[PDB]
Amino acid sequence: EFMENFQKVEKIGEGTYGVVYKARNKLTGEVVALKKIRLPSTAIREISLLKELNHPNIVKLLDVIHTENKLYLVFEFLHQDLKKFMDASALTGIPLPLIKSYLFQLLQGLAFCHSHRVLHRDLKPQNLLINTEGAIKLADFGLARAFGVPVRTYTHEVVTLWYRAPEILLGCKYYSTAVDIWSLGCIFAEMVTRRALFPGDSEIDQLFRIFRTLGTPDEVVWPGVTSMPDYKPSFPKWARQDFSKVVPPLDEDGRSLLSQMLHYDPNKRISAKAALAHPFFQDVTKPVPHLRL
Numbered sequence: 001e002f003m004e005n006f007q008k009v010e011k012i013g014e015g016t017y018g019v020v021y022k023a024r025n026k027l028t029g030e031v032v033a034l035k036k037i038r039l040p041s042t043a044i045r046e047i048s049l050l051k052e053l054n055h056p057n058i059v060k061l062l063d064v065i066h067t068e069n070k071l072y073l074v075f076e077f078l079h080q081d082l083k084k085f086m087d088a089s090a091l092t093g094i095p096l097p098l099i100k101s102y103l104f105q106l107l108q109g110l111a112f113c114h115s116h117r118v119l120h121r122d123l124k125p126q127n128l129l130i131n132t133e134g135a136i137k138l139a140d141f142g143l144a145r146a147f148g149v150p151v152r153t154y155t156h157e158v159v160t161l162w163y164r165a166p167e168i169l170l171g172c173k174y175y176s177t178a179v180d181i182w183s184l185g186c187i188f189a190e191m192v193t194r195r196a197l198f199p200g201d202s203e204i205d206q207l208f209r210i211f212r213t214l215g216t217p218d219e220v221v222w223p224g225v226t227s228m229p230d231y232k233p234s235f236p237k238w239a240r241q242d243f244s245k246v247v248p249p250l251d252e253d254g255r256s257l258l259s260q261m262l263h264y265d266p267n268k269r270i271s272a273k274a275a276l277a278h279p280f281f282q283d284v285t286k287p288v289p290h291l292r293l
C-alpha cells in the first residue's frame with residue numbers, strides 16, 4: 001500500500017539488491033529514486049544511520065521504509081550515471097578538466113564519509129551519478145556493510161570485480177577506507193583511457209590483471225602480503241609497468257596521484273584527504289558537462 005504514496009512509479013533499472021524505480025512522492029511532488037532491497041534488524045539500524053550522512057557529493061538518503069517484510073530506500077534522483085556518460089563520450093573522451101573536477105568532487109565525498117567511519121566498498125561507474133550543473137555524487141554508500149556484496153544480483157547479473165581492491169581479493173577480513181581509494185583510482189584511469197583498467201572476469205583473472213600491470217606484490221612493497229588468506233606462493237611473478245604506458249596521455253601530476261591511489265599496501269595508499277591536497281588539483285575547475293536528458 002506504500003506505493004500509493006507515489007503518484008507514478010516506473011522501473012529505471014536493476015540494482016545490486018533489487019529493482020530501482022523513478023517515482024513521484026504524492027504529498028511533496030518530489031521525484032525520487034526508490035530501491036527495493038530483496039531478502040533483518042541489524043541492517044535496519046545501520047541503514048537508518050546513513051540518513052544523517054549528508055554531503056553535496058553523496059546521493060541523499062531521504063527515507064528507509066520497512067513494510068510487509070520488504071525494505072525500500074528513497075534516494076535523491078539524478079538523471080545520468082558515469083557509465084552512461086563515459087559510453088556517450090567514447091569518441092572524444094571526457095575532457096581532462098571535467099575528469100579532474102569529477103575526481104576532486106568524488107574525493108570530497110569519500111573524505112566526508114571516511115571521516116565518519118563509513119565505507120562504500122563497491123564503487124563503480126554505475127553508482128556515480130551526475131547532474132547538469134557539473135556535480136557528481138556517490139550512490140549506495142554504506143549499503144555493502146549492511147547487506148554484503150553478493151557474487152550475483154537479484155536478477156543473476158554478475159557483480160563487477162573490476163574495481164575491487166587487492167586486499168579484498170586476497171581474503172583480508174578487515175576492510176579499510178583504502179578500498180574506496182583503490183576503486184576510485186581504477187575509475188580515474190578508465191575516464192582517462194576510455195578503457196577499464198582491470199576488467200577481470202573471475203577472482204583470479206582480476207588479481208592477475210592487477211599483477212600484470214602493477215607487478216606481483218611481494219613483502220618488499222607489501223609487508224604481510226605472503227601471509228594473506230588467499231595468497232599463493234605459486235602466483236606468477238610479473239614485473240611492474242610504467243604508468244606512462246598504462247594511462248597515456250595523463251600528466252606527471254595525474255600519474256603520481258594515480259600511483260598513490262593504487263599502492264598495494266592499504267596503509268601506504270593515499271587517503272581521500274591527502275589526495276585533495278595533491279598538486280594535480282592545483283588548477284581544478286567545475287566545468288558544465290553537455291548532457292542529453
Ligand SMILES: Nc1cccc(N)n1
Nearest residue numbers: 033059075076077078
Ligand atoms: N537515478 C538514480 C539512480 C540511482 C540512484 C539515484 N539516486 N538516482
